[PDB]
């Protein structure tokens, strides 16, 4: 599923991401835009053999099991394929664990390089929330 901007903002708000650990909703929409272009089916392989999955590009090195990342962890206790669903619940619940692990949203490289320090409120401007 390719979300619209305001559609995704409303779904993330219903799932409790607005101001979660102090990160306003626009931060999460901005991260999703540049990580996946709002596409739940996005995948990308990393140099070390791990793979990033879904709308927030969560990494099989630490967070999910895909059966092909030897020596990795599965800290969200899910198969990585669950992060590709049109229902974003699994991705949101795993992202909550990631952002709580000490480094905040710096875990998302695209957030750090393209959203951090910008006017992220623009990403929810005009949306009915
Ligand atoms: Cl857009
Ligand atoms: Cl915001
Ligand atoms: Cl594995
Ligand atoms: Cl949902
Ligand atoms: Cl933080
Ligand atoms: Na893994």
UniProtKB/Swiss-Prot annotation:
<dbReference type="GO" id="GO:0005783">
    <property type="term" value="C:endoplasmic reticulum"/>
</dbReference>
<feature type="disulfide bond">
    <location>
        <begin position="76"/>
        <end position="94"/>
    </location>
</feature>
<keyword id="KW-0081">Bacteriolytic enzyme</keyword>
<keyword id="KW-1015">Disulfide bond</keyword>
<dbReference type="GO" id="GO:0016998">
    <property type="term" value="P:cell wall macromolecule catabolic process"/>
</dbReference>
<dbReference type="GO" id="GO:0005615">
    <property type="term" value="C:extracellular space"/>
</dbReference>
<dbReference type="GO" id="GO:0050830">
    <property type="term" value="P:defense response to Gram-positive bacterium"/>
</dbReference>
<dbReference type="GO" id="GO:0050829">
    <property type="term" value="P:defense response to Gram-negative bacterium"/>
</dbReference>
<feature type="domain" description="C-type lysozyme">
    <location>
        <begin position="1"/>
        <end position="129"/>
    </location>
</feature>
<dbReference type="Pfam" id="PF00062">
    <property type="entry name" value="Lys"/>
</dbReference>
<comment type="similarity">
    <text>Belongs to the glycosyl hydrolase 22 family.</text>
</comment>
<dbReference type="GO" id="GO:0016231">
    <property type="term" value="F:beta-N-acetylglucosaminidase activity"/>
</dbReference>
<dbReference type="InterPro" id="IPR019799">
    <property type="entry name" value="Glyco_hydro_22_CS"/>
</dbReference>
<keyword id="KW-0929">Antimicrobial</keyword>
<dbReference type="GO" id="GO:0031640">
    <property type="term" value="P:killing of cells of another organism"/>
</dbReference>
<keyword id="KW-0732">Signal</keyword>
<feature type="binding site">
    <location>
        <position position="101"/>
    </location>
    <ligand>
        <name>substrate</name>
    </ligand>
</feature>
<feature type="active site">
    <location>
        <position position="52"/>
    </location>
</feature>
<feature type="disulfide bond">
    <location>
        <begin position="6"/>
        <end position="127"/>
    </location>
</feature>
<dbReference type="GO" id="GO:0042742">
    <property type="term" value="P:defense response to bacterium"/>
</dbReference>
<dbReference type="InterPro" id="IPR000974">
    <property type="entry name" value="Glyco_hydro_22_lys"/>
</dbReference>
<keyword id="KW-0020">Allergen</keyword>
<comment type="function">
    <text>Lysozymes have primarily a bacteriolytic function; those in tissues and body fluids are associated with the monocyte-macrophage system and enhance the activity of immunoagents. Has bacteriolytic activity against M.luteus.</text>
</comment>
<dbReference type="GO" id="GO:0005737">
    <property type="term" value="C:cytoplasm"/>
</dbReference>
<dbReference type="GO" id="GO:0003796">
    <property type="term" value="F:lysozyme activity"/>
</dbReference>
<keyword id="KW-0326">Glycosidase</keyword>
<feature type="disulfide bond">
    <location>
        <begin position="64"/>
        <end position="80"/>
    </location>
</feature>
<keyword id="KW-0378">Hydrolase</keyword>
<comment type="subunit">
    <text>Monomer.</text>
</comment>
<dbReference type="InterPro" id="IPR023346">
    <property type="entry name" value="Lysozyme-like_dom_sf"/>
</dbReference>
<feature type="active site">
    <location>
        <position position="35"/>
    </location>
</feature>
<protein>
    <recommendedName>
        <fullName>Lysozyme C</fullName>
        <ecNumber>3.2.1.17</ecNumber>
    </recommendedName>
</protein>
<keyword id="KW-0964">Secreted</keyword>
<dbReference type="InterPro" id="IPR001916">
    <property type="entry name" value="Glyco_hydro_22"/>
</dbReference>
<feature type="disulfide bond">
    <location>
        <begin position="30"/>
        <end position="115"/>
    </location>
</feature>
<dbReference type="GO" id="GO:0042802">
    <property type="term" value="F:identical protein binding"/>
</dbReference>
């Amino acid at each position: 599923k390719v979300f619209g901007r305001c559609e995704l903002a409303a779904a993330m708000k219903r799932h409790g991401l607005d101001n979660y650990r102090g990160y306003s909703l626009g931060n999460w929409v901005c991260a999703a835009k540049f990580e996946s272009n709002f596409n739940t089916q996005a995948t990308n392989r990393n140099t070390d053999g791990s793979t990033d999955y879904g709308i927030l590009q969560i990494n099989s090195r630490w967070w999910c099991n895909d059966g092909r990342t030897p020596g990795s962890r599965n800290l969200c206790n899910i198969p990585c394929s669950a992060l590709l669903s049109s229902d974003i619940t699994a991705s949101v619940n795993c992202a909550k664990k990631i952002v709580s692990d000490g480094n905040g949203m710096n875990a998302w490289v695209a957030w750090r390089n393209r959203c951090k320090g910008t006017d992220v409120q623009a990403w929810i401007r005009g949306c009915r929330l």
